[model samples]
Target: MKKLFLVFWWHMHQPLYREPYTGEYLLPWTFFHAVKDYYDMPAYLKDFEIKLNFNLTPVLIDQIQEYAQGKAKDVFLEAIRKDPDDLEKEEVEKLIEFTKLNYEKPIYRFERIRELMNKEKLNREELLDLQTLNLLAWCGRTLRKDLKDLLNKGRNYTQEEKEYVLNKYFEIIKKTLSIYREIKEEGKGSVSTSPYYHPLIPILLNPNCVYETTPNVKIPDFAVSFREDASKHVELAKEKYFEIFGEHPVYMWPPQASVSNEALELYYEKGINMLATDEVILKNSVERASPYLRYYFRELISVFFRDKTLSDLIGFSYHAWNAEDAVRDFIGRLKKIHESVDFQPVVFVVLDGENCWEYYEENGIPFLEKLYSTLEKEEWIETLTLEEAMRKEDVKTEVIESVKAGTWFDGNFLKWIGNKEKNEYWKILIEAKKKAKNDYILVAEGSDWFWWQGEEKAPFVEVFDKLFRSFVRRAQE
Candidate 1:
């Protein structure tokens, strides 16, 4: 009998680019505020008995301890509570500038959530959960960091205050480690052993995010940062996992599934047995596949497939449709995929769990309820976390050769990597990579620098140049 498996995965992250000069903790506050709401998701999932695997970045955990606390947590909530008008005079001016240019969009999202704080004021224990969501949201919305000057710079922040922020940031990291204990007790999220920090792994390892011309013309010129050292990549990832979870992680999500034979070999070195990637990477021939289709690449290391079409349908498409219709269309796509694959395929539907909430404010919850309920009836298909599905399922497919070096962006490299100017930036990093002794610091610089250049290339060309120049300097340091 053909067995159908459904695995849902989330890779949550936030870069550690809290304006070095100010240390005002804007990003931390924004994240903690989002955490306040995101905990509701885990609780809801728990109530529904849903099993899922998610990757949370180490930086996010730090933000929680920094701002998601008794007085600190209140500071975050208060930042959201008072209208932008009530902000500190200087903060109000900055907020006005941010709003005018859409700099603080995620922070603004919390306005609707103020009622939650008043009605259910968070506690130290509850703050942990709140902090978790906040960190994830910052990761999700990090793409928007360039749009605003969200930092308080120079004279504004005293050295003592900066130290306080940094201290709190580390404290939250320790507190986040506590969640691993909760995860162990709960048997939920796992710190899978994978190389590269993000879900699309290939882009993380290579300076180039894609190999061919992508549908979307937009792309950055160079890789802003690289793990100055790959060895350190494994070292920090392993250390952080062990420190937080009190055990080792076996499954890892390669940043953007930009993995290659080299990346896989590194995984072998690191002892990561399995990971997930988009189905496009597995197809022998280019043909349309349902977004809900999932698979195991090779038995040696399980390759869970991402259903891009389905995820985009919900993440990108469903926003236009009403919640009921969105849910119907979602299930319809799944049903069709089932019939096409004969119920044997492992369908991976991955998307931003929190970032896309704005699109579904009115009917999002109902759609989620309906989607979960629909799965309850389909005995042929079972819901799973990426790790669970890979462990329980067997693979019959062969990958024979490595898929093209690519990313989910337009099914090619266009978005974050492989643009001319970005290439120039990459050249600088490449030069730095040669001299850098530590890989952890080097790799952390990857996402923010280049992405800042790519999306904001025109107006921010100088910005990217200036930022990349700094990255090169840091790498040398």
Candidate 2:
């Protein structure tokens, strides 16, 4: 009897946020995610019989190294360590603002931080507790067990307790890689990577590729190509991957599942055996390949398009449903696929590993536990890492001669280009690419800037906007 094969690819990424001149980090997301999601995502799955595929961007790995070495400094870390009495009015205001960025559900989970936010007058101790609990709130649900005594103590945290909490944040950052290494060593998961700075490689190779997916989209005045830069991104990522994991990666999840034939040729030549993308792109392809089986693009590279329905449900929908209900519903959908197909089916559930957790209750810890625990006992469903699933002789597979140029969203490039603001940013990027003498050019090409354009705002959008323009400006000079 055949069984269902499930692959969960968790894409972990954050753009390079360090200033080219100053070593200071402009944004605290990398540090925040390190404490919250980086170490915990893999560690939490140890009890379950599942194989996960985690994609860690090279730039994020670099930041993790810096934090581990005590070379990194972020606004939150500095504020957290400073004496509450020494904090100026500005510092106190900043702490309040940063602490509020947490989702209301998790924010309230910390009694002190929640109470402080409601107070009319913020006292010195309240300010310190605000700083302490803010960092503590982002701690992984599993990792928080280590601090159960202090957390149970709750509100009036002494300076010593605050210091202890802050130190644990760094401890988590330091252990992030080891936690992953342990998971891989146990054969529970395989760690993959994205391009060095998470740029849209196909468009970086040639902007013309966009027209293949979005024919009438507005074009930039001057065409740009960075084929060599794209190669550099992959090479740098491979070097970093080896340094951290003691081995090279066999799979690559192109940023945003963005790919083209041109990019595929580059990836194949670079030694990437398997790649993954959004299922929408596969359906939109001229050949209309199925997501259930891996397809060989040119027979040189194998590809898997993420199941958007299942992926989006976890990323967007399930937060509204009961944990047990969501898992049951998800399992129901998988069974439907099992009954519909004659051969073993490979279901790819891929999404942002870090970003979605904050939106869920207890940062989706309960839901994840329910889902994984259920999968562990289900005999019909067998989880396999992407590499293992691809190598299975009994699993169905196919070959598609070509692929359409597109990304995970809408199977089009509209999200990252075509708007006036986005076009302007691209022009600046092209100018910087031609003039840049350093790797800062790669920073300018990151897919992050385009994400902030128009109405779709991300946390620290102002800082991101400033950083993008600053990189371009500094590159030209």
Best by lDDT: 2
How many steric clashes does model 2 contain?
0
TM-score of 1: 0.70
User: After aligning candidate 1 to the native by TM-score, how far in Å is the CA of 18 from where it should be?
Assistant: 2.8
Candidate 1 residue-wise lDDT, 238-324, digit = tens: 777777666666777666555565566666567677766666665522354333333333435655568778767877777667667
TM-score of every prediction relative to native: 0.70, 0.96
In Å, residue 48's CA in model 1 sits off its true spot by 0.6
| Model 2 misplaced stretches (Cα beyond 4 Å) | 456-459
Q: What is the lDDT of residue 152 in candidate 1?
A: 18
Worst 10 residues of 2 by lDDT: 99-108
- Model 1, position 290: C-alpha lDDT score: 36
Q: List model 2 lDDT by residue over 105-148, tens digit each.
A: 55347666668888988877887778777767776876678987
